[PDB]
């Protein structure tokens, strides 16, 4: 089957996005990679295939990092309700920043 | 004489700090390294040796990055009024983030 191209890590990050019902959602990430992320479903029902826009926020020590993102929902786990999402249209510098963030956590 | 330990780059960054007269200062950086930065003097007079606290802000693409910092003024150029500053008490993760930021610009 398909191969994982980007390592996934747990870290202190959140996604803020506008849901299907036009209500804001502020969800903590289950994990992050340079390709996408996962979070637990809440708010309006979430259907794989749907496109969203939001802001990924990371904070540690005295660092705040935010990235505007677009994402597609790829899957929802029918037990845990983990929503697996794929970033769309990241710029090369954005991918590289995410990779730095990820690898710095993996390394630690 | 003393040796430069950290490479310096120009990038889109600013420092926001509270000046000697208790007034906010928002200055664009002349350059940045993992050790410190430079900006052009403005506001209250700035005397080498003095300690300040502030927030270093970086923005590019859809990325916003901010770091709380402490710094000591090391020098003021008597012609250009460039204020050369040294970060104090950075945590290892903060130094590593700055280094990533710097090297990514040098590389480009
Ligand atoms: N951080 C994170 N990102 C997510 C998650 N779900 C989806 N993504 C992102 O969306 C891309 C596509 O996911 P996919 O449709 O599940 O498509 C996946 C899936 O079919 C498969 N795959 C990846 N990891 C595994 C695995 O551990 N086992 C199996 N059997 N398949 C995997 O390879 C495809 C490509 O994987 P990636 O390169 O990682 O590319 C992923 C990844 O960037 C998630 O829960 N967390
Ligand atoms: N980005 C930036 N950071 C600044 C600036 N001024 C001071 N800093 C920071 O403050 C530290 C000490 O600066 P210094 O007292 O001038 O002390 C300096 C200075 O005495 C000397 N030095 C550094 N670069 C040069 C150079 O190109 N020529 C000469 N002659 N001396 C240099 O080596 C010492 C250590 O340098 P660093 O390791 O870089 O360590 C620097 C650096 O982290 C600045 O204009 N921009
Ligand atoms: Cl992995
Ligand atoms: Cl240099």
Resolution in A: 1.7
CB-nearest partner of A91 from B61, B67, B97: B61
Helices H / strands E in chain A, number of each: 1, 6
- Residue A89 neighbours by CB under 8 Å, 6+ apart: A70
**Nearest listed ligand to the Cα of residue A32:** 1
Interchain proximity B67–A68, CB inside 8 Å: no
Gap between the Cα atoms of A25 and A30, Å rounded: 15
What would the two tokens of residue A101 be? 């963030």
Interchain proximity B61–A94, CB inside 8 Å: yes
Q: Testing the interface with B: which of A55, A61, A102 to mutate, by most B Cβ within 10 A?
A: A61
What sign for the dihedral angle of Cα B25, B26, B30, B36? positive
Asked if residue B85 lies in contact with residue B48, where contact means CB atoms within 8 angstroms, the answer is no
Experimental method: X-ray
Give chain A's domains with CATH numbers. Answer: 1-108 (2.40.10.220)
A32 pairs with which residues across the strands? A9, A37
């Amino acid at each position: 089957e398909a191969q994982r191209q980007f390592a996934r890590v747990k870290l202190p990050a959140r996604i803020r996005y506008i849901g299907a019902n036009r209500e804001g959602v502020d969800a903590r990430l289950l994990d992050l990679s340079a390709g996408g992320f996962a979070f637990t479903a809440s708010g309006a029902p979430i259907q794989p295939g749907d496109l969203y826009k939001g802001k990924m926020l990371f904070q540690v020590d005295s660092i705040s990092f935010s990235l505007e993102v677009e994402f597609q929902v790829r899957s929802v786990d029918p037990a845990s309700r983990a929503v697996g999402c794929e970033f769309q249209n990241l710029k090369p510098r954005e991918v590289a920043a995410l990779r730095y963030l990820i690898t710095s956590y993996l390394a630690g």
